[PDB]
Amino acid sequence: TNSHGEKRCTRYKLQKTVRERGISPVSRAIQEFEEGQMVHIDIDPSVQKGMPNPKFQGSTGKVIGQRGRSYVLEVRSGNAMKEVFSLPQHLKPQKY
Amino acid sequence: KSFIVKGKFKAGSTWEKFTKKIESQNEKNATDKTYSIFGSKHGVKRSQVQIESVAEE
Amino acid sequence: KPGSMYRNVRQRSFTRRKYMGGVPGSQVIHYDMGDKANTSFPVKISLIVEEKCQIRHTALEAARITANRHLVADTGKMGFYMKLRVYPHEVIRENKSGMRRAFGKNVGTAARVKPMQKIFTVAVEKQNFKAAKEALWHAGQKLPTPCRIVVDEGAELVQ
RNA sequence: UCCGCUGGUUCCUUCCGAAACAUGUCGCAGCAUGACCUGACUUGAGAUCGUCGGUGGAGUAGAGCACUGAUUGGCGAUUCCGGGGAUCCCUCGCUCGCUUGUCAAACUCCAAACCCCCCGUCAUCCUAGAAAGUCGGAGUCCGGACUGCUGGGGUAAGCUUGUAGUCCGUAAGGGAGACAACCCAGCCCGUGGUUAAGGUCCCCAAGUGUCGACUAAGUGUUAAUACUAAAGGGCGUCCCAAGCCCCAGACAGCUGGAAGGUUAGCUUAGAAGCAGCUACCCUUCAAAGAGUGCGUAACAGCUCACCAGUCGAGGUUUGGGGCCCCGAAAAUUGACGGGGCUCAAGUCGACCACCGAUACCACGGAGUACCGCAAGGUAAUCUCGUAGGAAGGCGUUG
RNA sequence: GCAGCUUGCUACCUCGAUGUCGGUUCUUUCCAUCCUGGCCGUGCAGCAGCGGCCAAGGGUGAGGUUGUUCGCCUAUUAAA
Ligand SMILES: [Mg+2]
Ligand SMILES: [Mg+2]
Ligand SMILES: [Mg+2]
Ligand SMILES: [Mg+2]
Ligand SMILES: [Mg+2]
Ligand SMILES: [Mg+2]
């Protein structure tokens, strides 16, 4: 039977480009966001902790608040709203 | 009424050339006659019988 | 089994050796024929395919044998250089219960082709061109697809 | 008695109108919860079925060998890990590099078109109430088919199991010979008009229509289609291109020539050009040969190849195309829908006129939705319908 | 490639019933020809063979074992 764990079908989803593997840039981890500021979900495989479920890959949410070193996002899946915790290392601003 | 026609048509999976001489009262009818004759002879339509020149002879 | 059982391309490829098991060997022994060390044949003709299909290795072996016999009989042992191109990488499986767990098991090997894709190639002199055409026409008779002959190099010489 | 299993369940109109799917189940002919349908109420301003531009997600098609596995020969060496036959006398496969020829669903240095989230813009809906929320009533969890995905499996199947769109189910009317789901069209009633699909020799309304060619087989006269035969061949016929010889003369014939030497090497006697080595048997003349055949123990002439005189205009080799022919045999009598059809009533490329729906236009009428105190106003953006929800009426006895 | 005459594959119709195998009787259809009619080739002297083409008008039987179809065997026969 097929499994239904939390990392299924992520062979290429959670990979790094060949000229990207290793230590990722550190400035991406100290970026700071404010309220109501659209961001993009782009999971960085190099960081093991604070990773949202990879089904939210490539979605855009808005910041709602901060809990420690993690921002609270508001992502739409289908017709629902899902609140996703993610460290700022996996996030990326929207360029207007 | 004599005329000269030159062009290329898609015979099968390749491009050929022709120099048919068609009798006709004028030149537009010469082009039409060329198209009709090629349709009769090779089953092609008016999209693979590109006529380069219909110069009078 | 009959030839038409495994000749159409309807399903995905199935070629990874390390996952399947027990693929039987092949019969075709040598893929180069004739004078390999020569490189000065001015005419280079070849047999091409008019439709996608699968060719069993046995058909390729029969075609190679017949072309070899004809070419050696007429042109000579040192007057040509034949070279087969397509190698059989596909695998053929035959179910053998009914439809209960109908997935098959390996029975042979096949080589897929594509339209206008060269299969054989013969190089000869100017005096043995007709013999080359005569040889390549029999080889295409054992082959499971319509085939036409194209003179690739030295077309102005022969034509 | 009980059953999740079979049969039956009685009047009219009006408004709206599905699911044959997911999870759990001693669950698979059942049921619960959710998706989908319907009625009412609360709140009070936005929403996104669509277009364009941008910030992002790609790892599929295709393509390729840069990783992982395979794969074809040539060349140069591994002075190994190796098999062939006391200096391992030396052969040398596996292997490592340069070049050639193939691959991949569980390969990728590459890499689309669809598609998804968000921002701006246009566009449509909306105070006659967007988005959201609360409560009442359900049906449904036997599906099927067509067009795409070379979908997966299977020899294949009107097979089985997926996915996107649209349909039948529950869809009239027009056309396909008849046709659940194919083409036009989604339908209140009556009258007039013009068209769509499709057709115009007769059956059958409207063309024995026009222009240019092809087919000689009754081939064909069959959009899709579960209903239509293949490889191979044709000096059958209609076209295009490319070479070669050519009126001081090309091809088919009329002619003879093919004489020098030889009776080639040959043992059987003899395979004397035609069992078996060779070579152009003539310095030389068109011709003259080691040469096919009637003949041929051997031959021999007759003469093959091969040229020469002769007529008197085109001849010849190949490649790519259209139609047709052979390949092609089944059981009641018979299926282009039928009659029949040959410069067509068939095929190919174009064109003109007309016929033909409930579609579209106009007029009159009914009902409905919403608003308005009423009178009445708006409706291209209202009128199909099974399970089912809701509203108003008719009838029988008291 | 053709046929659907062997066995498979599928589950489209029939479970408020479409009465199974073999033989017997009687009628008919197909040709992919066993004999009878006509032709062609031969490594066809004659006789008799071998191979192929047209042709479905007529014929294609009697018995022993076995439930058998199928198949084996016997003596005839133009062929059984
Ligand atoms: Mg690919
Ligand atoms: Mg139920
Ligand atoms: Mg449809
Ligand atoms: Mg419908
Ligand atoms: Mg209808
Ligand atoms: Mg109802």
Among the listed residues B2, B1, B3, B8, the one whose alpha carbon sits nearest the alpha carbon of residue B51: B8
Strand order through the sheet with A91-93: A80-86, A71-77, A60-66, A38-41, A91-93
CA–CA separation, B33 and A66 (whole Å) = 80
Nearest nucleotide to C85, CA against C1' atoms: D101
Is B20 in contact with B30 (CB distance < 8 Å)? no
Nominal resolution in Å?
Answer: 2.8
Tokens of C117: 């894709």
CA–CA separation, C126 and C40 (whole Å) = 12
CA–CA separation, B44 and B14 (whole Å) = 13
Among the listed residues B15, B13, B9, the one whose alpha carbon sits nearest the alpha carbon of residue C116: B13
Alpha helices in chain B (DSSP H): 27-42
Report, in ranges, which bases of strand D sit under 7 Å from a protein C-beta: 54-60, 69-75, 101-107, 109-110, 116-119, 132, 150-157, 211-214, 231-233, 238-243, 318-323, 347-350
Neighbours of chain A (3+ CB pairs under 8 A): none
End-to-end Cα spacing for chain B: 8
Alpha helices in chain C (DSSP H): 57-74, 129-139, 155-158
Is A40 in contact with A94 (CB distance < 8 Å)? yes
Q: Is the CB of A38 under 7 A from strand D?
A: yes
Long-range contacts of C90-95 (CB under 8 A, 24+ apart): C90/C13, C90/C14, C90/C15, C90/C54, C91/C14, C91/C15, C91/C20, C91/C23, C92/C6, C92/C54, C92/C56, C93/C14, C94/C1, C94/C5
Tell me, in angstroms, the distance from the centre of ligand 5 to residue C143's CA: 50
Distance CA A72 to C1' E29 in A: 87
Q: Is the CB of C96 under 7 A from strand E?
A: no
Please, which residues have CB within 8 angstroms of residue A91's CB and are 6 or more apart in sequence? A31, A33, A39, A40, A41, A42, A71, A73
Nearest nucleotide to C97, CA against C1' atoms: E9
The residues facing C122 across adjacent strands are C45
Tell me, in angstroms, the distance from the centre of ligand 2 to residue A1's CA: 29
Is C67 in contact with C120 (CB distance < 8 Å)? yes
Q: How far are the Cα atoms of A41, C72, C91 from residue C12, in angstroms, in the given order?
A: 35, 40, 11
Q: Is the CB of C99 under 7 A from strand E?
A: yes
CA–CA separation, A1 and A33 (whole Å) = 43
